[PDB]
């Protein structure tokens, strides 16, 4: 009845598509913005650096 020896299961998303649940991703997104924020932290002020 079957076409061959075995039949591997289908991944729902495409192979290599990154996905994650829970509170870890939104913390990573916030930490990503804070990482960009730290570059512009000492630039603020009339006594900042280029």
């Amino acid at each position: 009845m079957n076409f061959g020896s075995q039949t591997p299961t289908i991944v729902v998303l495409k192979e290599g598509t990154d996905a994650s649940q829970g509170k870890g991703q939104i913390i990573s997104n916030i930490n990503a913005c804070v990482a960009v924020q730290e570059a512009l932290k000492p630039t603020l002020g009339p006594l900042g650096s280029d």
Binding site: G24, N31, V34, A35, E38
Partner: protein
Amino acid sequence: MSQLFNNSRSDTLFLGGEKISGDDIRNQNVLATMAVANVVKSSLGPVGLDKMLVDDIGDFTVTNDGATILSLLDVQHPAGKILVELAQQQDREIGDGTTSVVIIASELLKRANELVKNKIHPTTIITGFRVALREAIRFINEVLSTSVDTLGKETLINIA
């Protein structure tokens, strides 16, 4: 949180790995602490739930204790090894609060790093914790309760 790795410096030539300084170290040390603190954060208390760790030979270990879960997690980072050996020191001495002492240390390094960014020295921060802890142990002595008017072994049962 750290990005854009430090440049190899030609004026300071040391054998082995490159030197790195600034606030990135305390950011990396806290980031290394969150790598282990988030592991033990979920398995705290009755409602807490634990995880599994395979031994790469089919065997695994479902562990609730903080000393056991950190013993199998061989942390290559230097700052994480302090908390790994602390739990091995905690469970041998007292055998209780192994998860809380790591969670307390992680929250301290979080807010301590925030205070260093607020431009107060760590020596003043450490002096603030020691005078606070000396009053805390004095307050722990105030809230003690001696077992009295208890029927049989009930105080040993409910505390277990």
